[PDB]
Amino acid sequence: LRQLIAQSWHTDEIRKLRPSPVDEAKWGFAVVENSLWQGVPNYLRELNEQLEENLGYKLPVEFVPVRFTSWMGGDRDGNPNVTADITRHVLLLSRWKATDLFLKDIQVLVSELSMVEATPELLALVGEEGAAEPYRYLMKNLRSRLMATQAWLEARLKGEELPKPEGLLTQNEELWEPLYACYQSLQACGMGIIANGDLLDTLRRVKCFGVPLVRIDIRQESTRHTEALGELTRYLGIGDYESWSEADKQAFLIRELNSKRPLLPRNWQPSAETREVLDTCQVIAEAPQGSIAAYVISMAKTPSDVLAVHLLLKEAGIGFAMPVAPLFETLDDLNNANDVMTQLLNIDWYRGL
Amino acid sequence: LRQLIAQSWHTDEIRKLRPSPVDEAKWGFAVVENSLWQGVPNYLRELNEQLEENLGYKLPVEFVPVRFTSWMGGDRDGNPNVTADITRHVLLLSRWKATDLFLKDIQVLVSELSMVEATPELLALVGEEGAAEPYRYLMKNLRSRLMATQAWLEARLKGEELPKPEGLLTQNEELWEPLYACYQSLQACGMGIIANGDLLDTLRRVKCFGVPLVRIDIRQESTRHTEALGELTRYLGIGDYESWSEADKQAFLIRELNSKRPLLPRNWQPSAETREVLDTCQVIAEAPQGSIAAYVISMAKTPSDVLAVHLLLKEAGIGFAMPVAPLFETLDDLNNANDVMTQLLNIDWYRGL
Amino acid sequence: LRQLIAQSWHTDEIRKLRPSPVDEAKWGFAVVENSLWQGVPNYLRELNEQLEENLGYKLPVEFVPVRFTSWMGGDRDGNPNVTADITRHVLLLSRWKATDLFLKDIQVLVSELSMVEATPELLALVGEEGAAEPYRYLMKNLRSRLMATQAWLEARLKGEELPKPEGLLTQNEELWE
């Protein structure tokens, strides 16, 4: 205790310079490893004991109701320093860190799963080679696969581009799958107590944190999307989006949202600001699905504000449906909020997207 | 002589299978190294001796009127096997081979240019470090630079992608420049006879063959460009280009040629054929300027045939003006040829391009 | 001719410092590649034509009566500068150079020996894999083996110690065979 207190009196650190989005993103990893990593599964164990005791049933293993997300390196609202480059970086770092923590979990499992009794199905999944140490086989495979993607990300973090390894991890299913295979045979074969221990903790961290460790949220003001699209439209000679009435903008946006011909000029020369808007949707599009939780529009005032980001994301080439969220943060915006959403819900195109 | 004849009687080789564009491209490199390499400069020496003797003047060193080009791996007219991939490859191989032959030239120069007397200008160009062996300095630099790009291309040829070296050679000026520097000081400093020997031979091979060794020509039928563009237009819901009258197609082509908004769908799914047409313009665009001599349109029948390839090249993102050539190869096309070109020359847009 | 003479008038080199045993050893490699390399075999061809013409028989292929040796980097008599280190080096360099010249010979052979007819014994020696291009097989093998030892010696010359490759060449029998 004395040692620890002396530490803090003498271990003085004072930032001399403004922290950076990466620094802030790093503090969030500190919170994840020093507390959330143990905390979520314990929360899930207690919660589960209580359901059975009081209600008579336990949630199924596949149901993990908690998820942690971060805005660190995702929120650019009013922050010049959070550029598309930094987001790209932070996106990368999270994956590096999930590999770090996932490795510790798997080491433990590689040594503790010395069981040799497996189900037809599980033996099938390995069949020979590792059929004399089945659960250890699957954990050994994943360790390598994790070690591979780890190695890849430290290169990328360094600025080195190099083809990605055979077993690069991008999705939680790639982690979940094998882990769940062990659980099932362990349960099936009478090793329930081993299944429900460290593996269960890892199964739940997979869905709670997974591959990205902590999904990020992107957030930019509505105003900046308008400027990007105005600049685009004047360059194309189509007109000036930031002057059109709101009925016109929706018209323009629904037209283009349904259009099969592209709009974003192949090799263009926009202003810094606009490029940032364009680059960030490119990072979104580029990132593995499930890395980004949502696109938040601070200062959302009209139906065109939401349709705008959908247009940009489409131009950035995005394969999945990205949840966009208006952020009403004024008395009148709050007051108009329900009107803004019923109009949005009335557009059939929006409704189905 | 007996040895050599026996060789051919017994050294029997018979292709068992159809040669490939690369094979044919290789035979062309054999012709270049076994005969053109010595032949062009000798031709240029004789030609120059004759001008001075009979007319009283010699052409200037910078004027090399001969250039060799190949269609091998460039001509796809009627040849399925000459795909955009093969062209990309052959394009690469030529550069590998020019590095091979250029290295032999430079070795000779690195050892023979032991002169130490240089001009202010030439010493300036090195200044210290290699200022005690100036011409040897510049040749030593180029040797490395050639050896660097050589190394790079053998990787690419192998299918390995890796950032390109500091001094990668892409243009003839990169070779010409230093070589010409030596010539000037050698002349200036009284070493005329050394200048006009092996260096002069290398100077002329630079412009005659240069970096690409032998520029290629691309050639596809007009008919295939029509199909690519028809397919595109029906996908976009604009109509069907291969049904429109010729006045309409020109209208469509001049419209799009002036358009700042792109046309080629970001991530599209065309037919094999169309993709080949699209991929090849991508190779053209991707290749260093001066690798491709011209785009030949076999079966050119109307003004829209030429405007078509310009449209496609624009969609493929091309920074320079690529010479397109109609190939009239029928009695009626021949007969209509002058009509076809006066209409083309009457379009102001075409005239200025 | 004019070019060549001008070369020598203007290509002036004058050692400023005493040459070293390696330099002298290098001049000897220049003599070997610019003249002995072609010279010995021509001498052996002429000599052989003459035996058959005048005496009626030719020496057997295995009999090569000439051998060249050097004292460069071997003679320390009165020469401090020719230390055990230099000899070690020169010993190494010679092997590097024999690999250089032997490679040129083998390239030629790898391309010119396109024959497919071989003896039981020769096919046996390859048996399958390269049994559809037999002489080319054996030359291809040796090229690699030479390229391997070449690579090894340039490392050693550089001062790098690293285990020696599978097919390192050390004896003439390895080439002869």
Side-chain angles (χ1 to χ4, degrees):
Chain A
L1 188 68
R2 194 142 191 277
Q3 233 139 59
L4 249 356
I5 296 326
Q7 255 140 90
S8 293
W9 178 244
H10 293 117
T11 323
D12 83 310
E13 324 273 59
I14 291 300
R15 50 194 9 138
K16 340 89 254 118
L17 321 133
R18 182 148 341 253
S20 104
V22 186
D23 284 342
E24 308 178 329
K26 275 147 138 36
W27 167 101
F29 305 149
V31 179
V32 182
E33 86 163 321
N34 282 298
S35 164
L36 304 190
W37 205 264
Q38 286 136 86
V40 183
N42 293 338
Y43 149 63
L44 281 140
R45 232 168 242 294
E46 288 326 307
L47 175 81
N48 247 66
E49 236 106 77
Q50 303 281 290
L51 297 181
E52 199 157 38
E53 211 219 315
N54 303 81
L55 309 176
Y57 51 94
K58 301 211 277 303
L59 295 170
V61 150
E62 327 102 45
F63 176 64
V64 177
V66 231
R67 276 149 233 96
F68 273 78
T69 298
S70 164
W71 265 25
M72 295 109 94
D75 180 27
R76 53 251 320 154
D77 188 344
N79 189 190
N81 317 301
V82 185
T83 63
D85 266 337
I86 303 281
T87 304
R88 192 175 283 106
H89 195 174
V90 177
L91 263 172
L92 277 177
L93 251 189
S94 312
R95 297 164 66 222
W96 177 87
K97 190 71 183 173
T99 245
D100 184 40
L101 318 169
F102 276 108
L103 245 9
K104 313 176 144 99
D105 276 33
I106 309 302
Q107 277 302 345
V108 178
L109 283 146
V110 174
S111 49
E112 269 161 33
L113 302 180
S114 323
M115 303 65 219
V116 200
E117 319 173 344
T119 38
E121 310 145 70
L122 188 83
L123 287 143
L125 235 292
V126 175
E128 294 181 8
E129 194 188 353
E133 167 148 309
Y135 306 92
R136 172 130 52 200
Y137 199 35
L138 302 173
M139 305 305 292
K140 264 204 236 114
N141 276 312
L142 217 187
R143 170 153 116 273
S144 223
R145 178 134 193 243
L146 234 4
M147 274 200 306
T149 128
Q150 177 155 57
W152 191 65
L153 306 148
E154 326 188 349
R156 314 267 326 99
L157 283 155
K158 258 155 253 223
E160 304 184 1
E161 313 171 351
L162 19 140
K164 27 147 96 50
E166 197 167 348
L168 195 76
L169 293 163
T170 22
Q171 321 255 46
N172 297 173
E173 278 83 31
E174 294 171 323
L175 265 172
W176 180 271
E177 251 208 277
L179 291 172
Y180 191 52
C182 296
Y183 188 94
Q184 256 185 299
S185 29
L186 282 171
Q187 291 262 326
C189 281
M191 278 142 293
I193 350 229
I194 302 295
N196 288 292
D198 303 278
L199 196 58
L200 191 39
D201 280 28
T202 305
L203 248 355
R204 318 186 149 160
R205 313 170 164 104
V206 160
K207 310 194 110 163
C208 176
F209 320 81
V211 163
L213 189 73
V214 140
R215 294 177 301 174
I216 315 180
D217 259 4
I218 302 288
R219 147 184 196 246
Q220 187 49 271
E221 51 176 317
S222 65
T223 243
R224 237 170 98 159
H225 299 118
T226 293
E227 285 169 333
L229 244 31
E231 158 140 316
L232 171 54
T233 68
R234 321 101 180 241
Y235 176 80
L236 285 200
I238 315 180
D240 169 20
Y241 185 92
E242 87 214 36
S243 309
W244 303 341
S245 71
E246 167 68 26
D248 288 330
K249 315 211 198 196
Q250 301 172 19
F252 171 71
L253 298 168
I254 300 155
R255 214 188 317 128
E256 294 320 336
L257 246 318
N258 278 251
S259 193
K260 232 116 102 246
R261 100 116 88 179
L263 216 108
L264 206 36
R266 183 275 166 162
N267 238 276
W268 184 31
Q269 46 123 85
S271 43
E273 303 233 358
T274 312
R275 176 180 216 132
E276 251 331 307
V277 176
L278 297 153
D279 283 351
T280 312
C281 310
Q282 206 207 335
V283 170
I284 306 162
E286 244 113 274
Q289 189 172 340
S291 312
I292 310 240
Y295 197 126
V296 158
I297 304 153
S298 71
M299 287 272 200
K301 306 180 170 293
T302 62
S304 91
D305 294 37
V306 157
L307 292 162
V309 326
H310 268 104
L311 175 82
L312 292 184
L313 297 172
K314 189 243 214 181
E315 272 343 281
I318 188 129
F320 49 94
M322 167 85 158
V324 172
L327 168 60
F328 306 114
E329 63 184 70
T330 252
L331 195 60
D332 330 60
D333 299 320
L334 261 176
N335 285 347
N336 295 106
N338 174 73
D339 271 312
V340 174
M341 309 297 306
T342 117
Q343 180 40 23
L344 283 171
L345 304 164
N346 277 313
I347 302 175
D348 290 359
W349 181 81
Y350 190 77
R351 211 146 85 264
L353 161 88
Chain B
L1 188 68
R2 194 142 191 277
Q3 233 139 59
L4 249 356
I5 296 326
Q7 255 140 90
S8 293
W9 178 244
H10 293 117
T11 323
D12 83 310
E13 324 273 59
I14 291 300
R15 50 194 9 138
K16 340 89 254 118
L17 321 133
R18 182 148 341 253
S20 104
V22 186
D23 284 342
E24 308 178 329
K26 275 147 138 36
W27 167 101
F29 305 149
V31 179
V32 182
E33 86 163 321
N34 282 298
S35 164
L36 304 190
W37 205 264
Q38 286 136 86
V40 183
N42 293 338
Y43 149 63
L44 281 140
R45 232 168 242 294
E46 288 326 307
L47 175 81
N48 247 66
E49 236 106 77
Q50 303 281 290
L51 297 181
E52 199 157 38
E53 211 219 315
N54 303 81
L55 309 176
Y57 51 94
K58 301 211 277 303
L59 295 170
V61 150
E62 327 102 45
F63 176 64
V64 177
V66 231
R67 276 149 233 96
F68 273 78
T69 298
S70 164
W71 265 25
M72 295 109 94
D75 180 27
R76 53 251 320 154
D77 188 344
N79 189 190
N81 317 301
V82 185
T83 63
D85 266 337
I86 303 281
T87 304
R88 192 175 283 106
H89 195 174
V90 177
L91 263 172
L92 277 177
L93 251 189
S94 312
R95 297 164 66 222
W96 177 87
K97 190 71 183 173
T99 245
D100 184 40
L101 318 169
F102 276 108
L103 245 9
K104 313 176 144 99
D105 276 33
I106 309 302
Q107 277 302 345
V108 178
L109 283 146
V110 174
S111 49
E112 269 161 33
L113 302 180
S114 323
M115 303 65 219
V116 200
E117 319 173 344
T119 38
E121 310 145 70
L122 188 83
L123 287 143
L125 235 292
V126 175
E128 294 181 8
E129 194 188 353
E133 167 148 309
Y135 306 92
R136 172 130 52 200
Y137 199 35
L138 302 173
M139 305 305 292
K140 264 204 236 114
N141 276 312
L142 217 187
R143 170 153 116 273
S144 223
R145 178 134 193 243
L146 234 4
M147 274 200 306
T149 128
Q150 177 155 57
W152 191 65
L153 306 148
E154 326 188 349
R156 314 267 326 99
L157 283 155
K158 258 155 253 223
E160 304 184 1
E161 313 171 351
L162 19 140
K164 27 147 96 50
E166 197 167 348
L168 195 76
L169 293 163
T170 22
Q171 321 255 46
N172 297 173
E173 278 83 31
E174 294 171 323
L175 265 172
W176 180 271
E177 251 208 277
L179 291 172
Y180 191 52
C182 296
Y183 188 94
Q184 256 185 299
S185 29
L186 282 171
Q187 291 262 326
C189 281
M191 278 142 293
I193 350 229
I194 302 295
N196 288 292
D198 303 278
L199 196 58
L200 191 39
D201 280 28
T202 305
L203 248 355
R204 318 186 149 160
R205 313 170 164 104
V206 160
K207 310 194 110 163
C208 176
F209 320 81
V211 163
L213 189 73
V214 140
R215 294 177 301 174
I216 315 180
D217 259 4
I218 302 288
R219 147 184 196 246
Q220 187 49 271
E221 51 176 317
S222 65
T223 243
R224 237 170 98 159
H225 299 118
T226 293
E227 285 169 333
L229 244 31
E231 158 140 316
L232 171 54
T233 68
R234 321 101 180 241
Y235 176 80
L236 285 200
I238 315 180
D240 169 20
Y241 185 92
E242 87 214 36
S243 309
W244 303 341
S245 71
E246 167 68 26
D248 288 330
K249 315 211 198 196
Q250 301 172 19
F252 171 71
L253 298 168
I254 300 155
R255 214 188 317 128
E256 294 320 336
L257 246 318
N258 278 251
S259 193
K260 232 116 102 246
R261 100 116 88 179
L263 216 108
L264 206 36
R266 183 275 166 162
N267 238 276
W268 184 31
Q269 46 123 85
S271 43
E273 303 233 358
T274 312
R275 176 180 216 132
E276 251 331 307
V277 176
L278 297 153
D279 283 351
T280 312
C281 310
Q282 206 207 335
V283 170
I284 306 162
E286 244 113 274
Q289 189 172 340
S291 312
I292 310 240
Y295 197 126
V296 158
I297 304 153
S298 71
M299 287 272 200
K301 306 180 170 293
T302 62
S304 91
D305 294 37
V306 157
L307 292 162
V309 326
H310 268 104
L311 175 82
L312 292 184
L313 297 172
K314 189 243 214 181
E315 272 343 281
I318 188 129
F320 49 94
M322 167 85 158
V324 172
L327 168 60
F328 306 114
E329 63 184 70
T330 252
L331 195 60
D332 330 60
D333 299 320
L334 261 176
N335 285 347
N336 295 106
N338 174 73
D339 271 312
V340 174
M341 309 297 306
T342 117
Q343 180 40 23
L344 283 171
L345 304 164
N346 277 313
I347 302 175
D348 290 359
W349 181 81
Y350 190 77
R351 211 146 85 264
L353 161 88
Chain C
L1 188 68
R2 194 142 191 277
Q3 233 139 59
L4 249 356
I5 296 326
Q7 255 140 90
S8 293
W9 178 244
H10 293 117
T11 323
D12 83 310
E13 324 273 59
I14 291 300
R15 50 194 9 138
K16 340 89 254 118
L17 321 133
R18 182 148 341 253
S20 104
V22 186
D23 284 342
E24 308 178 329
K26 275 147 138 36
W27 167 101
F29 305 149
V31 179
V32 182
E33 86 163 321
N34 282 298
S35 164
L36 304 190
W37 205 264
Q38 286 136 86
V40 183
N42 293 338
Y43 149 63
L44 281 140
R45 232 168 242 294
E46 288 326 307
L47 175 81
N48 247 66
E49 236 106 77
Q50 303 281 290
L51 297 181
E52 199 157 38
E53 211 219 315
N54 303 81
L55 309 176
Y57 51 94
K58 301 211 277 303
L59 295 170
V61 150
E62 327 102 45
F63 176 64
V64 177
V66 231
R67 276 149 233 96
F68 273 78
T69 298
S70 164
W71 265 25
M72 295 109 94
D75 180 27
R76 53 251 320 154
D77 188 344
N79 189 190
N81 317 301
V82 185
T83 63
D85 266 337
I86 303 281
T87 304
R88 192 175 283 106
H89 195 174
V90 177
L91 263 172
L92 277 177
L93 251 189
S94 312
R95 297 164 66 222
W96 177 87
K97 190 71 183 173
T99 245
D100 184 40
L101 318 169
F102 276 108
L103 245 9
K104 313 176 144 99
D105 276 33
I106 309 302
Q107 277 302 345
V108 178
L109 283 146
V110 174
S111 49
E112 269 161 33
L113 302 180
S114 323
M115 303 65 219
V116 200
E117 319 173 344
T119 38
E121 310 145 70
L122 188 83
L123 287 143
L125 235 292
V126 175
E128 294 181 8
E129 194 188 353
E133 167 148 309
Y135 306 92
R136 172 130 52 200
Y137 199 35
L138 302 173
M139 305 305 292
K140 264 204 236 114
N141 276 312
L142 217 187
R143 170 153 116 273
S144 223
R145 178 134 193 243
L146 234 4
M147 274 200 306
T149 128
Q150 177 155 57
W152 191 65
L153 306 148
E154 326 188 349
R156 314 267 326 99
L157 283 155
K158 258 155 253 223
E160 304 184 1
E161 313 171 351
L162 19 140
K164 27 147 96 50
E166 197 167 348
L168 195 76
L169 293 163
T170 22
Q171 321 255 46
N172 297 173
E173 278 83 31
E174 294 171 323
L175 265 172
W176 180 271
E177 251 208 277

